[PDB]
């Protein structure tokens, strides 16, 4: 049947890069909430790229670079957010860990300390899929691939919005945006407009082995990450299609 769970007690939390882009006004409340969560969970904290990835895309695309070149350039920005977040949690014993370390030595590190910080981008690098000039396997996709491969207890996506809407709640179609309390990966995959998560996340969710639901919560509201890590419904729940017994 299904493969085994490597780290079934692990909680994975993905921090959106645009949340980090807001500076200390957003980072300091989130840091204080993460400190109080350390005694309650074993945390793998993964950071996204944010606006700086858009700038290196703009320069790289203007230079004509392929998608296999842009993918690790954007990944680098997710790592800088990780070093920033880890530095703020260093007094609690948290450090940033590298992708080879996350792949092979995560069990020892979570035995030494309550949480580690890593990059959410996957190491696809020059082997990124063709088709689009924008790298598809980004921070959301990498965070779920890792959490599902580990068989983690859950994955929570921390955004700068309450969840997924029927339209961009910050774009030109703001007035017609209806909030979605719960949806599925296959429902979102058959839609057309933009989303706050990678569309490649929906594809890996269809073939998921363990993670049954992923919640998208607003990290700009203190407490929602705490509630989400306890299974409370405070954002958008995304059903992956995995059935439990």
């Amino acid at each position: 049947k299904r493969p085994i769970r490597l780290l079934p007690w692990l909680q994975v939390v993905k921090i959106g890069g645009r949340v980090m882009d807001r500076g200390a006004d957003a980072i300091l409340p989130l840091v204080e909430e993460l400190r109080k969560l350390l005694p309650e969970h074993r945390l793998l904290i993964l950071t996204g790229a944010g606006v700086r990835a858009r700038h290196v895309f703009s320069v790289g695309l203007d230079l004509g670079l392929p998608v296999g070149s842009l993918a690790p350039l954007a990944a680098s920005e997710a790592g800088q957010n990780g070093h920033i977040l880890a530095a703020m949690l260093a007094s609690e014993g948290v450090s940033y860990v590298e992708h080879p370390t996350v792949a092979d030595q995560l069990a020892i590190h979570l035995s030494a300390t309550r949480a580690v910080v890593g990059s959410a981008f996957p190491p696809y690098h020059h082997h990124e899929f063709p088709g689009s000039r924008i790298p598809p396997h980004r921070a959301d996709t990498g965070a779920f691939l890792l959490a599902d491969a580990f068989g983690a207890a859950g994955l929570t996506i921390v955004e700068n919005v309450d969840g997924i809407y029927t339209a961009d709640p910050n774009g030109p179609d703001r007035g017609q945006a209806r909030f979605l309390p719960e949806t599925s990966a296959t429902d979102l995959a058959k839609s057309e407009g933009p989303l706050p998560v990678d569309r490649a996340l929906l594809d890996v969710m269809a073939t998921a082995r363990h993670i049954e639901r992923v919640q998208v919560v607003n990290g700009l509201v203190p407490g929602r990450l705490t509630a989400a890590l306890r299974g409370e419904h405070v954002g958008t729940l995304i059903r992956t299609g995995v059935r439990p017994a």
């Binding site: 695309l61 392929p66 933009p194």
Partner: protein
């Protein structure tokens, strides 16, 4: 369409926005290594067969690199199938199987690189470029491992724990992202048939076929890994590949000279 509109879309809109994706698709296309050719030496089909298969191909590589820039990727083979069997029986996920398969492809890159070392050709184990520009310029060839670096982030197949993206996909993706001019898979079969020639009495050789025609006849997972066909349809630089028999003397040399040996698979 303009540079200013692409910039404003990249800053204001999400990367999933259809209008942002459409603007990025209009950007210029730069090939990093346009005059190079990516070759895959099959693990189970070639290297696992020992000197009777590897030695003539070493001679062709040394001879052909005088007129061609060659990126030489290695497959895995029976040792990776043994690792996959041990780990699948334990219920280990595809991400772990991917790491095990990489080491076997690293093994084959070592053995091939040590037979070519006295010709100056290095193994691109240790870095992942710059070792490649400098060596392609001076010695015209490099050896590398064909396994993709996904490791625990390996995209799993619809069912089963065997990694769907292995040494065929790894070599092709490198060819596509570097904008190389040619991709040649060196196997132990003359090419694609209407059936499996090892276990079929009456199969028919196919000199040229597209991906859509292969799917319409049940040849999706045959001589090539089935995700490679889907990657080929989405590629921008490498729009066709060639499968040749490495056990035939001079087949790699003649394929590099533009001869239509084996089977040419086109994206459309």
């Amino acid at each position: 369409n303009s540079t200013a509109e692409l910039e404003e879309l990249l800053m204001q809109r999400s990367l999933t926005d259809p209008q942002l994706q459409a603007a990025a698709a209009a950007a210029a296309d730069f090939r990093i290594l346009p005059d190079a050719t990516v070759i895959k030496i099959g693990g189970q089909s070639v290297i696992d067969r020992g000197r009777a298969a590897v030695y003539p191909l070493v001679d062709e590589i040394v001879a052909a690199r005088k007129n061609h820039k060659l990126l030489i990727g290695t497959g895995a083979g029976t040792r990776a199938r043994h690792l996959y069997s041990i780990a699948a029986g334990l219920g280990l996920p595809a991400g772990v199987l991917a790491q095990l398969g990489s080491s076997v492809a690293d093994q084959n890159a070592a053995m091939l690189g040590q037979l070519l070392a006295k010709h100056g050709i290095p193994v691109v184990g240790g870095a992942g470029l710059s070792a490649v520009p400098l060596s392609l310029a001076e010695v015209n060839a490099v050896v590398f491992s064909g396994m993709p670096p996904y490791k625990l982030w390996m995209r799993p197949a619809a069912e089963g724990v065997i990694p769907p993206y292995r040494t065929d996909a790894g070599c092709f993706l490198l060819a596509e992202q570097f904008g190389c001019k040619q991709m040649i898979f060196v196997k132990d079969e003359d090419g694609l048939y209407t059936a499996n020639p090892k276990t079929s009495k009456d199969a028919t050789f196919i000199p040229r076929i597209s991906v859509d025609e292969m799917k319409a006849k049940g040849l999706h997972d045959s001589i090539l890994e089935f995700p490679v066909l889907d990657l080929l349809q989405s590629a921008q630089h490498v729009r066709e590949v060639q499968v040749v028999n490495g056990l035939v003397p001079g087949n790699l040399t003649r394929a590099l000279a533009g001869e239509h040996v084996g089977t040419i698979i086109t994206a459309s």
